[PDB]
Design a protein around this ligand. Structure first.
Ligand SMILES: COc1cc(NS(=O)(=O)c2ccc(N)cc2)ncn1
Ligand SMILES: COc1cc(NS(=O)(=O)c2ccc(N)cc2)ncn1
Ligand SMILES: COc1cc(NS(=O)(=O)c2ccc(N)cc2)ncn1
Ligand SMILES: [Mg+2]
Ligand SMILES: [Zn+2]
Ligand SMILES: [Zn+2]
Ligand SMILES: [Zn+2]
Lengths: 160, 160, 160
C-alpha cells in the first residue's frame, strides 16, 4: 500500500576478553568480543529495534527477556527472525534496512558482504534492500579507545 | 499523497539535582532531573527536531529560542504541539514517529506507555503510529555514568 | 513510483587548532578545524553515507578510497556530487535529506542557509527538500568539550 512507516535503532556493547566477536552474524577474529546476554550482536540488535520501532511494537526489552524458555539460549539471528515474524504478524512488510557499525578495530570491510547476506536471509529480503556501513570513531571517546562497538539502523516498512 | 519526507532528531541534557525529571511529558519520581532552559524534556525535543527536519523547517532552536525568557521552564508538550501546528501549516501530515531514550537510570519501562500516549495526543496520532524505546548505554561513557540522558527520533511525514 | 528506501549516515572528526573548519561546504572562522584526509567535511560525509545506504550501495569507504587517483584531490562536495550520480544510475531519485550537526562551538546557525544551498545544488534538489539542524552537546563528552564534531543524516529515495 502507501502506509509507510520508519524506525530507527541504536545499540552499544562493551568489548571484553574471552568471548568471540560476532557482528551481523559474522564471527570476526579478534582478541575481544562483545559483552551481553548471548552473542551480543550489536548490529542485529540495532536492526531489530529499528524494525520493532517502525511497526510500533516497542523494543527488544519489551519482546525478549532473559527468562522466556523459547528464547533462553537464542542467538541474535534467531531473535532477528522472531522480530521479523512479529512485524509481519502486525501486518507490515519490510521494504529496506540500512545500518552503520562504529568500531575503531578490527577492520570490518572484509566481513560486510557476509553480514548483509545474513541479514537479508533472516529478513527474507533481496540483497539490494539491505545495507551495512562501517566507520571508526576517529579515536574519540569510549568507541575510539576500543572499549565498545556501536551500531545504528534505519528501517522502512509498509502496512499492506 | 506520495510526497513522503523523513526527519531525524537528537538531543541530550545533563542530569542534575534539584530539577524535575520530565521525559515524554511524564514527571518521573527521581532525585535528579534534566537541566535546560525549558523543562528540558529530551525526548520531546528530539521528536520536535525530527518533525521540523522532515518538513525542512529548520530545528527547535530556530523556532523556540533557548535564550528567549518566554520559554524559561516551557512545557515541551506545548512546544511539540506548536511544532506540529507549523508542520501542518507547511502542508504535511505526520505518518509515524519512532524514538529511543538512552539512560542508566531510573528505570523507564513503567513510564513508556504514558510517554507514547502523550506524544500521540500532541501529534493527533493513534497510539499505533507512535513508538518509544528505552535502552541503557551498557555502562559506557557519560551516559553510562548517569551524567545525562540522550534521545533519538525519526519521523515520516507526507505533503498533502 | 512507490519503491521508497531510507538511508542513515554518521560521521565524526577531531577538532584541533591548525586546520580550517569546513562544514556543509562552508568555511567557518574558528580557532580549531576538523582533522581528516582533505577538508574533513563531517556533514557532507554523513549525507553521502545516508545516500549510499538508501541505495544499498555500501558506504564512503567502498566508493572513495584515500589512495584512488580519481578522488585523491577531491573535496567533499565533489564526492557528494559523484555519490548522487551513482545513486541516480542505480535507479533512485532523492526525495529529501535531513541532518544534524553536533558541535559545542562555534555557533552554526548563521551558516545554515549556505550549507542547505550547497547541499541542494550538489544533489540537484529543491531547497525545501534539504534540512540542516545544529545543536550543542550540553558540555557532555568529547563533543561537549570541543574535541570533535559529529554529523547525523537521514535520506529518503525512491526507485524509478
Ligand atoms: C534488553 O534490551 C537490549 C538488550 C540488548 N542486548 S543483550 O543485553 O545481550 C540481550 C538481552 C536480552 C535478550 N533477549 C537479547 C539480548 N541489546 C539491545 N537491547
Ligand atoms: C535550542 O536548541 C535546543 C534546545 C533544547 N533544550 S532547551 O535549551 O531546554 C530549550 C530552550 C528553549 C526552548 N524553547 C526549547 C528548548 N533542546 C534541543 N535543542
Ligand atoms: C572512508 O570513510 C569515511 C571517511 C571520512 N572522512 S576522511 O577519512 O577524511 C575521508 C577519507 C576518504 C575520502 N575520500 C574522503 C574523506 N568520513 C567518513 N567516512
Ligand atoms: Mg552518540
Ligand atoms: Zn544489544
Ligand atoms: Zn533539549
Ligand atoms: Zn568524515
Amino acid at each position: 500500500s502507501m502506509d509507510f512507516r520508519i524506525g530507527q535503532g541504536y545499540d552499544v556493547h562493551q568489548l571484553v576478553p574471552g568471548r568471540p566477536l560476532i557482528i551481523g552474524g559474522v564471527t570476526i577474529p579478534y582478541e575481544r568480543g562483545l559483552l551481553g546476554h548471548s552473542d551480543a550482536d550489536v548490529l542485529l540488535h540495532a536492526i531489530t529495534d529499528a524494525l520493532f520501532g517502525a511497526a510500533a511494537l516497542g523494543d527488544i526489552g519489551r519482546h525478549f527477556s532473559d527468562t522466556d524458555p523459547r528464547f533462553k539460549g537464542a542467538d541474535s539471528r534467531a531473535l532477528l527472525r522472531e522480530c521479523a515474524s512479529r512485524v509481519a504478524q502486525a501486518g507490515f512488510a519490510i521494504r529496506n534496512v540500512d545500518s552503520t557499525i562504529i568500531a575503531q578495530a578490527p577492520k570490518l570491510a572484509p566481513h560486510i558482504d557476509a553480514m548483509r547476506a545474513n541479514i537479508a536471509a533472516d529478513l527474507d529480503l533481496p540483497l539490494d534492500r539491505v545495507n551495512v556501513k562501517a566507520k571508526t570513531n576517529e579515536k574519540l571517546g569510549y568507541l575510539g579507545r576500543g572499549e565498545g562497538i556501536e551500531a545504528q539502523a534505519a528501517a522502512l516498512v509498509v502496512r499492506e
